[PDB]
Design a protein around this ligand. Structure first.
Ligand SMILES: COc1ccc2[nH]cc(CN(C)C)c2c1
Ligand SMILES: [Zn+2]
Ligand SMILES: [Zn+2]
Ligand SMILES: [Zn+2]
Length: 459
């Protein structure tokens, strides 16, 4: 059970309005043949054009919703819509382009897919709600054959050039005109009742239907994301490294230790309530405080209601001490909290568009995160940058320039002059802090938090 067999059945009911008379008995093999393609009994790494739900999940970063709406079928012009918000018009002779022949439209499709997927995936997965036109229009922009490598690098081939007879990946396809060996999945095969809008609108209110091909392409990918990442959650799937994944995770650990440690020194809470990751360890292991853990898995649909996390009768008195919500999304945080909430609006290679305002954050694992809402932090304020260190001033073992900063809470800075060791550690921590903030994370803390209370922790 590795790939989707070509001898698997394909439900043709959704295709009979664009293709009337389509036989009820259909296999993927017969479908691909009908689409104008020949697999020629090729055991060269491309066993089927269509892929399984399991394979689609592993290749989520390659997902591009695709829809084709007839404007007027070799006689009539077609509207090609993609989840990128692009709308191209092909002639046979919400960015809306005018009518142009297939030879020029295929060039634009290559450029668009390459600019979208070069820093995301090694392929493309056309996410369909197949009705006919999208499948029968693929022979005009897709070429297939054995698995190949790029003519300028070692990545797999994703494009083909009829001008130079060569193959390229998304990084080196400038001037390329055919999509080489794409993948696709028909969401309609998963067994649904009713049309795309009825199913999409059951879960999402952010994507509307404007009756343009790209709106359907958007609702299609959004629905597929809901079914595989919102209602069904598999955190055992590993995702390859494509960016600053390691620096981001490392920074999150350094920032959490710093924030939680300084908070316990400034206000000296008797007890900390650790609400979140059931696998969690104390982020500040040498703290005087009482560490109480409460298990909560990452919510993928709606943010937890603070009433169901705390009430229904644990210290029970969460009001005593401080609550720590590190990536645990709740509707409204109590006033005595320390919070790290991911901002779903962040633009990055790790963050993919989500369902109902949420985003799919892919860093080692896929986490669909509910929509960012600034009203959840009414009882808190944003946590400002600060660097704290009780460690001794001792350099050990990189060229220096004296550091002058009001946010370097150290004994040397208290004494008037920042030592080389704390200036080195401050600059590194500020880099990790900036890395984390830029990745989309947001820090919030109780209103009474004041870094001025850290200066007397050295006497
Ligand atoms: C710790 O961060 C990551 C992020 C993405 C990753 N993909 C593969 C690995 C390897 N890991 C299992 C050690 C990974 C780690
Ligand atoms: Zn290449
Ligand atoms: Zn949606
Ligand atoms: Zn120092």
């Amino acid at each position: 059970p590795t790939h989707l067999s070509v001898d698997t059945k394909f439900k043709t009911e959704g295709l009979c309005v664009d293709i009337p008379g389509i036989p009820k008995d259909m296999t993927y093999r017969r479908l691909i043949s009908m689409m104008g393609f020949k697999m020629n009994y090729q055991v060269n790494g491309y066993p089927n054009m269509f892929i399984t739900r399991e394979e689609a999940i592993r290749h989520v970063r390659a997902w591009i919703g695709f829809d084709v709406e007839g404007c007027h079928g070799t006689n009539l012009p077609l509207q090609l819509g993609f989840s990128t918000g692009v709308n191209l018009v092909a002639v046979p002779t919400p960015l809306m382009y005018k009518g142009l022949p297939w030879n020029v439209v295929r060039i634009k499709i290559v450029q668009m897919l390459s600019d979208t997927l070069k820093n995301l995936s090694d392929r493309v997965v056309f996410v369909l709600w197949a009705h006919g036109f999208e499948l029968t229009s693929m022979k005009y922009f897709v070429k297939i054959g054995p698995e190949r490598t790029c003519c300028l690098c070692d990545r797999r081939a994703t494009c083909f050039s009829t001008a130079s007879d060569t193959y390229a990946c998304w990084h080196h396809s400038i001037g390329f005109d055919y999509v080489y060996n794409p993948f696709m999945i028909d969401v309609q095969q998963w067994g649904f009742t009713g049309n795309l809008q009825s199913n999409h609108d059951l879960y999402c209110q952010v994507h509307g239907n404007a009756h343009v091909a790209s709106c359907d392409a958007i609702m299609t990918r959004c629905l597929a994301v809901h079914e595989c990442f919102v209602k069904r959650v598999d955190w055992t799937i590993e995702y390859p490294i494509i960016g600053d994944e390691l620096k981001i995770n490392a920074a999150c650990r350094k920032v959490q230790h710093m924030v939680v440690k300084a908070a316990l020194l400034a206000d000296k809470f008797p007890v900390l309530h650790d609400i979140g990751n059931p696998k969690a360890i104390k982020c500040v292991p040498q703290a005087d405080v009482e560490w109480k853990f409460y298990d909560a898995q990452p919510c993928s649909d709606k943010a937890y209601k603070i009433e169901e996390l705390f009430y229904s009768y644990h210290s029970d008195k969460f009001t005593d001490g401080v609550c720590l919500f590190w990536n645990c999304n709740v509707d409204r945080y109590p006033a005595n909290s320390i919070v790290c909430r991911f901002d779903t609006r962040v633009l990055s290679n790790l963050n993919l568009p989500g369902c109902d305002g949420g985003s799919l954050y892919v860093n080692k694992h896929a986490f669909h995160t509910p929509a960012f809402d600034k009203s959840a932090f009414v009882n808190l304020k944003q946590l400002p940058f600060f660097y704290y260190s009780d460690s001794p001033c001792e350099s050990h073992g990189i060229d220096y320039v004296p550091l002058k900063s009001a946010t370097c809470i150290t004994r040397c800075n208290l004494g008037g002059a920042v030592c080389r060791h704390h200036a080195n550690e401050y600059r590194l921590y500020l880099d990790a802090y900036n890395m984390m903030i830029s990745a989309g994370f947001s820090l919030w803390v109780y209103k009474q938090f004041d870094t001025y209370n850290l200066w007397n922790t050295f006497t």
